Design a protein around this ligand. Sequence first.
Ligand SMILES: Nc1ncnc2c1ncn2[C@@H]1O[C@H](COP(=O)(O)OP(=O)(O)O)[C@@H](O)[C@H]1O
Ligand SMILES: Nc1ncnc2c1ncn2[C@@H]1O[C@H](COP(=O)(O)OP(=O)(O)O)[C@@H](O)[C@H]1O
Ligand SMILES: O=c1[nH]c(=O)n([C@H]2C[C@H](O)[C@@H](COP(=O)(O)O)O2)cc1I
Ligand SMILES: O=c1[nH]c(=O)n([C@H]2C[C@H](O)[C@@H](COP(=O)(O)O)O2)cc1I
Lengths: 313, 313
Amino acid sequence: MPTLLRVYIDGPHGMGKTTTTQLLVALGSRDDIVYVPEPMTYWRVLGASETIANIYTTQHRLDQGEISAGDAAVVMTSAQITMGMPYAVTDAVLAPHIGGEAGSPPPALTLIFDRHPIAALLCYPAARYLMGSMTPQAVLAFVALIPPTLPGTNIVLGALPEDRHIDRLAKRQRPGERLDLAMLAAIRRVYGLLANTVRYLQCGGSWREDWGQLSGPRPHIGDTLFTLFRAPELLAPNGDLYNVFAWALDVLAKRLRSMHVFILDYDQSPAGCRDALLQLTSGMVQTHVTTPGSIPTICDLARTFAREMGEAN
Amino acid sequence: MPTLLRVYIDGPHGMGKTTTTQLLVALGSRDDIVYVPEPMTYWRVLGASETIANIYTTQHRLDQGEISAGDAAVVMTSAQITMGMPYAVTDAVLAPHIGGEAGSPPPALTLIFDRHPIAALLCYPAARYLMGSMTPQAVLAFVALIPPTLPGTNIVLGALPEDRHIDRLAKRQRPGERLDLAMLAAIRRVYGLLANTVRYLQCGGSWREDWGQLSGPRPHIGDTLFTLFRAPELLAPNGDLYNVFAWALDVLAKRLRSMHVFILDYDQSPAGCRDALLQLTSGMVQTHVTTPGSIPTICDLARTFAREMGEAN
Ligand SMILES: Nc1ncnc2c1ncn2[C@@H]1O[C@H](COP(=O)(O)OP(=O)(O)O)[C@@H](O)[C@H]1O
Ligand SMILES: Nc1ncnc2c1ncn2[C@@H]1O[C@H](COP(=O)(O)OP(=O)(O)O)[C@@H](O)[C@H]1O
Ligand SMILES: O=c1[nH]c(=O)n([C@H]2C[C@H](O)[C@@H](COP(=O)(O)O)O2)cc1I
Ligand SMILES: O=c1[nH]c(=O)n([C@H]2C[C@H](O)[C@@H](COP(=O)(O)O)O2)cc1I
């Protein structure tokens, strides 16, 4: 029986992330490590043309009052659909090879991913929800879609003080991307409410038993994303969310409840960061692979991905 | 051990469907039958305002050359997202109660659903793909999303000659819906290519081993939806689809492969139709329910749904 360690490096944009991955795989470590980059080529080319562009453009156009919110909403939403597709189809072809969580022995393979599905399917959609560019209802469709959480889902988030983080963002700018402090501060809030609802849920937290606290480190319903959904458009005349929306919070729960969050302090020098990441690795969960031939396939798969969609490495 | 029979009545729009459901549940049959309607209230109100409207409007606007395809594409796509959400969140809260397929004994509960997820997540998105209103790439994101097919997924499709079907469509018109023969003929083609790929796959059909036939009742790759994806935008310079798109066909497969299609001849009088539907029921698959208390919950769930979203019954 073998294990394969999957590490899902995430958090908001411009926080040492891609820098510390190529510095972690630079250690000359044998090919037991498979690094998969952002699906950027899907983004810029094969998916749509400069999808990144639209997101950041449609915002200026929105902020500078040149479209109705419902206009920014609809583009902002296909922006998201097209953003996530590539994270999903992968996760689809990787699922049938993932056996149980054999605790934390050495993994015969270690996948280091640049961003995990819920970045494009929950986090950003939620940030735009706060940015007036995404609709509560649309946000929860992505929520209602988030594929079943697989075993061994170790998600590595981040930590850097607003200031030094801002400074970092302003030292590199993406292809067709603008600089947005609100959208920044926004994401930083989703990446907290999220890495907070895990902790909370993991500790027996139930959004339904806690709802009326919202009405008016051990976190409460108030520190969870669940707050963001106490929006007018989702509440019936009785003040209770409609069940359409209600059930979907249950879905959302069951997805986050089973995740393995860790948070690396990006406050250090690139090398040390990766050292830390490397150390976090130890206590992470590893999983058996259903088919004995799975590992190689799980290799090719991600290797093929990074071949076809990594404008990074 | 109990079983619960789930029947997913589908096929294109305006084909006796909603008529024959309310005629099937009209038999006075005890409350062991739970009928769940289309989530229309989500559609018209709580989801977005007159979503149905946009689909059919954005088309005229497209056909009458008043928007770029990429304009119709983006609305047409959120139209779809918002259409399907309600089918999904349900399927999410229904999954954790579905145990294995105990073959075809009597079910302690029978759910009769008006349309199944892949109507809003594969079929229509695919029809618009043919209607110039949906992009190949967007179509395959919904494909890459189609939640894992649960056991006991008996999908009831339909049969009525184009002519008599057209005549039927023109005897009732939806809230903010227009009459489109192409969009009609289109859907009728998706509902065939789909109920065809099942048969084909079920018979050992592999899209990859069959691909080069496309290049240039026992059906071939040419009778499958797989044809629709042999579009320019998905093919690399070598002519092979890119793996992003490639894997997603694999996803699509694994979803359809496990479905239980049946097709009722809608050519009869309403009563008899339902009699037939009733007979099809017999040979359908039933499933055990993981939690012993599942059945009641599976009752309330769908009953609550139809309470909150059934502008039909
Ligand atoms: N430890 C660090 N010290 C100083 N600058 C850093 C450090 N890590 C990343 N940066 C820089 O800050 C920006 C954000 O990092 P990057 O890896 O490029 O992005 P992201 O975190 O969004 O994936 C980049 O310009 C990068 O060079
Ligand atoms: N067996 C039938 N004989 C004659 N007319 C029918 C029959 N079944 C349905 N219709 C009519 O044709 C239209 C399509 O049926 P309906 O149940 O309303 O829609 P749908 O099939 O799209 O769910 C309706 O106007 C309906 O009254
Ligand atoms: O769902 C998403 N939405 C989004 O707007 N981005 C933007 C943020 C940033 O401009 C770029 C991702 O680059 P970095 O993660 O390297 O910062 O795409 C990324 C994802 I995933
Ligand atoms: O994914 C979908 N896309 C779509 O355009 N419709 C339209 C077709 C028709 O106008 C109406 C559904 O009504 P009937 O199924 O009763 O025909 O919504 C429905 C679904 I589900």
